[PDB]
Amino acid sequence: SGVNNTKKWKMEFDTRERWENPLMGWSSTADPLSNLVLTFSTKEDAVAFAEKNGWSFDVEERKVPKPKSKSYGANFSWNKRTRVSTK
Amino acid sequence: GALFVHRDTPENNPDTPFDFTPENYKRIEAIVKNYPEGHKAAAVLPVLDLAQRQNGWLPISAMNKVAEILQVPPMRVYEVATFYTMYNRKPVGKYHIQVCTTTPCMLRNSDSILEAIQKKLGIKVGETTPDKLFTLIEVECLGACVNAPMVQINDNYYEDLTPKDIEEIIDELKAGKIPKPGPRSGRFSCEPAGGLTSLTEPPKGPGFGVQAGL
Amino acid sequence: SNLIEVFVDGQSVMVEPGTTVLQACEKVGMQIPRFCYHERLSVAGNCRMCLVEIEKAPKVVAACAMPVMKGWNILTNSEKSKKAREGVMEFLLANHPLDCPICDQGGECDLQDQSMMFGSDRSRFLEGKRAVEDKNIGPLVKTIMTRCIQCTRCIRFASEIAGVDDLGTTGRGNDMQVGTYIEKMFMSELSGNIIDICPVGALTSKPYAFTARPWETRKTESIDVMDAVGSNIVVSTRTGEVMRILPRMHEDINEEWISDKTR
Amino acid sequence: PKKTSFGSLKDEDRIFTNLYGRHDWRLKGAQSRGDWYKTKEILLKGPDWILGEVKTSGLRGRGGAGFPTGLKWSFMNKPSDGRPKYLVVNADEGEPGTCKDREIIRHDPHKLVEGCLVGGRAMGARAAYIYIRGEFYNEASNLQVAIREAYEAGLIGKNACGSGYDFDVFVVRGAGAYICGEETALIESIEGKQGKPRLKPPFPADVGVFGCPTTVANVETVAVSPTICRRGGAWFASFGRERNSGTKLFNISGHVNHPCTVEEEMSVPLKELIEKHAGGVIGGWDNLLAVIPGGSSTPLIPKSVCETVLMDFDALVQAQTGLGTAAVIVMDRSTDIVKAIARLIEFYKHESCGQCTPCREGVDWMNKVMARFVKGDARPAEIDSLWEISKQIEGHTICALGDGAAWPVQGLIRHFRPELEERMQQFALQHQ
Amino acid sequence: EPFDNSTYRNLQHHEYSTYTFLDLNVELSKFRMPQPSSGRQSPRH
Ligand SMILES: Cc1cc2nc3c(=O)[nH]c(=O)nc-3n(C[C@H](O)[C@H](O)[C@H](O)COP(=O)(O)O)c2cc1C
Ligand code: SF4
Ligand code: SF4
Ligand code: SF4
Ligand code: FES
Ligand code: FES
Ligand SMILES: [K+]
């Protein structure tokens, strides 16, 4: 329920092949740029890194919870069909 | 008991025979019309009590059936059935032997009365008689604390009891006889044990110190 | 116009009348700890962790179900607030079973993080903990009911978002068993969402069943294709396999729920 | 000019002229005792006059809260938005030691139903919801047949006492709980839901039963209302202390010679009450160990303070307790205070609402620790922790019963801490 | 007629049947008023 991990822009690279090692079942890969994420304060600063390092980037947008309206009085209404059946 | 996960059983199965008498149905409709429409589910508690009167305990079929008469989801009836006190989710004896051991009620040695019932019936706290007439189960403050340790026999109040006073009361119920619900002493309802210290002279009649026409 | 001026930790915020206290401090980043208040769900105040110190007030207030009005400074970090946070959380952890080594929610465990942030570092409990029998309500949701603490989250979700009025509470006191009473089978198109709204590791994904643990898995974002709504999902993968499918947040698309078909 | 002492309330001034059940509790006897007199003008004068004498009387809360009835009922004086206004009467009698309501439901029912009618007229309410405790069966039927008699007399309902106002009366029997005594649980229990109290403010005056403007009131609080308006608030303000005016039934129980209840002036020296009506604590006054002044929730008080302390809301407050419901419970010297408190707080555990975290986890935890103290297996350090968790319970609960169970623990600690300590050393000695 | 403070004439509660509560509740149902309407039949509607 906490929202501390959704306050910093992060840049990550695409996933590549993950084959199992013959000797013992492993997750061996051959893409060095696999476990490399980078935190960024704001989006324009994050993307400024991408062109500067010449990486074909894809940008999403900062999804934020829309502001809701909560009222404990609604749980017991006279006519409105929002009367909670049990607390 | 202290159980709250009902398990379907040969007697307490969802198909357990339960209904409401034609006399009963006109009582539920009286309960329903007493309460405003749009909130008729408020009548769940009186109806659930009424089912208890009809068939004693409350089988799961009885709780399910009253749920359909109240157009209420069956579990919502389940919650209120297993949250209150006199709703008997399991079969009980013909006379529910209730006793209070709260501090204002136990200060006058309620244990002696409770022990006296236990030895006379040969029934420990919680279980019922082998003949299924009496069930001695302890309850909290029932409301008559100003009197001596009292017992709630099924549905009537007996007060001012004594380790001897329950004895002849119990065997009265055993041998098909009801006693008089009330204090077992000279005190009628709540009067002082030594006599009367209030309401001595006749009360003032209608009309005393009315200011102007009111 | 209509905006009511209230203060949080001294700083003044501009809030729409009827705003709850919890929302007001959220506008500045202060996230009051919670266990019962879910934004998509109703408000119940059963959590008793959102207790916060009102300025020049004698009584700690429940930040969730309280409409804030003007001339109030929400003393989030006050000593009175922290003591209330400490008090109720110790009550929460009193009867939690020593399971989270094996409890699957270990790693998310909304109890663990809040204990690591708002809670003591030792237990003064000297009695025996209560144990609660498990109830089966699905081959897809596990129920170690002895762990969960007075949900009102499972209950509201069933009665508001899924409509299935089968989950409930049974009894009072310390036990007050939460479940279905009779042996019923909680199936709905959105039944699986009780798993990710469970702060405690009682309602857990039965197909998951300790396949992996949170820190080791990598989360990638995608869109489900099982339905045509197109719910945004998070495909948690590790070592080259998919263990869990989690619902992302997209509001208008899927809120934060996904169908059991997609999960 | 002012009453230096208090007590010996005039018998004519005793509001409940049938509290002992020694007079006809039917309609005919009630009106023969002053009931149902000039209700016409009482209903005709409107809420403004009815509430005016309530302000003049300054009736304090008789249900265990002590809140002034005046402004509490004044919250209803407000134009209707469409939601019908209701009035409910709390008759749970949940508190151990409470018996005052139980007797006066059956002994003078018509006075109570007339009390609702006068209260409802000021309240602008539509229907009366007297929520009687389910165990209270015979008295509930006694009150209901009284309502039928009043209905046949055309006193309530259609054209109440020929005044145009229409006020219905319903007797709803509960299904057994302390918690239903709480005002929001009573609303929840009436609504057919689980008897779990709802949160704080949305207010009952705004959102009450079925989401309608309502206000709970103790049975005695509305019982005195007719006698209030007929004789004015000047009746009630004459007796009692400064903002502790009026009279009240006093549930004297426990280790006393004559356990009984009695209507008497309030703010009376506590020694006078237990010595006059109860004939002193058994074994004499010196045999008294502690007194629970009103209700279990209010902390107990040792005899060192019981010498004088007047029985009124303020006087109990500096006595580190409260008047509550004037349920006088008296322990003697032979009484084990630790055992009595454990029995008291074990009752709270059984009658715990279960909703909120503190009162559910803490009170059950209070049971475990306090049970260990009674046996004595505990260690001396745990005494203060019980105090700490008691403060954690206090003020952190939706229901006031949590604070109603923390106070007895605090009262026991503050007044008899050596008693547990020596009892604690006794266990550590014989067990070795 | 004479004032006698020695009788508990409240004794009709002794011969009270279990059904009595609802039994006489049925009979005054005539002496009631039409209950207010919430509009919708039930909160589930
Ligand atoms: C746990 C609990 C139980 C209560 N039980 C009762 C009761 O049995 N009778 C009562 O009159 N008030 C009781 N009250 C007090 C109510 O909150 C409320 O003050 C009362 O119903 C009406 O008080 P008033 O007449 O002063 O308005 C209880 C409160 C709590 C918290
Ligand atoms: S919920 Fe599970 S992971 Fe969290 S503390 Fe309890 S047992 Fe441990
Ligand atoms: S599983 Fe989660 S939501 Fe359900 S009762 Fe347990 S803690 Fe509460
Ligand atoms: S404090 Fe206890 S009695 Fe009060 S609402 Fe919470 S659980 Fe119920
Ligand atoms: S004290 Fe015995 S009934 Fe409350
Ligand atoms: S967040 Fe749980 S009580 Fe407000
Ligand atoms: K979970």
What are the defining features of this structure?
5 chains, D: 432 residues, 11% strand, E: 45 residues, mainly alpha, binds flavin mononucleotide, binds FE2/S2 (inorganic) cluster, binds potassium ion, electron transport, in-situ cryo-EM structure
Work out the radius of gyration of chain A.
23 Å
Number of strands of chain A: 2
Q: What percentage of the residues of chain A does DSSP assign to strands (E)?
A: 5-15%
Rg estimate of chain B, integer Å: 22 Å
Bound molecules: flavin mononucleotide, iron/sulfur cluster, FE2/S2 (inorganic) cluster, potassium ion
Portion of residues in helices of chain A? 10-25%
Tally of separate helices of chain A: 1
Major sheet of chain A, described briefly? 2 strands, antiparallel
**Strand residue content of chain B:** 5-15%
Question: Can you walk through the features of this model?
Answer:
This is part of a larger assembly, with chains A (87 residues), B (214 residues), C (263 residues), D (432 residues) and E (45 residues). Chain A has 87 residues and is low in regular secondary structure. Chain A is built from 1 helix and 2 strands; from the N terminus they run ββα. Chain A has a two-stranded antiparallel sheet. Chain B is of the alpha+beta class. Helix content of chain B is 33%, strand content 8%. In chain B, α3 packs across α4 and α6 packs parallel to α7. In chain C, the strands form 4 sheets. Chain C has a 5-stranded mixed sheet. Chain C has a 3-stranded antiparallel sheet with strand order 10-11-12, with no helix packed on it. Chain C starts with a strand and ends in a 16-residue tail after the last strand. Chain C is an alpha+beta fold. Chain E is mainly alpha-helical and 45 residues long. In chain E, 18% of the residues lie in helices and 0% in strands. Chain E has 1 helix and no strands. Chains B and D meet through α2, α4 and α5 of B and α5, β3, α10, β6 and β7 of D. The complex binds flavin mononucleotide (FMN), iron/sulfur cluster (SF4) (3 copies), FE2/S2 (inorganic) cluster (2 copies) and potassium ion (K). The site of one FE2/S2 (inorganic) cluster has 12 residues of chain C, from loops. Chain E: This is NADH:ubiquinone oxidoreductase subunit V3. Chain D: This is NADH dehydrogenase [ubiquinone] flavoprotein 1, mitochondrial.
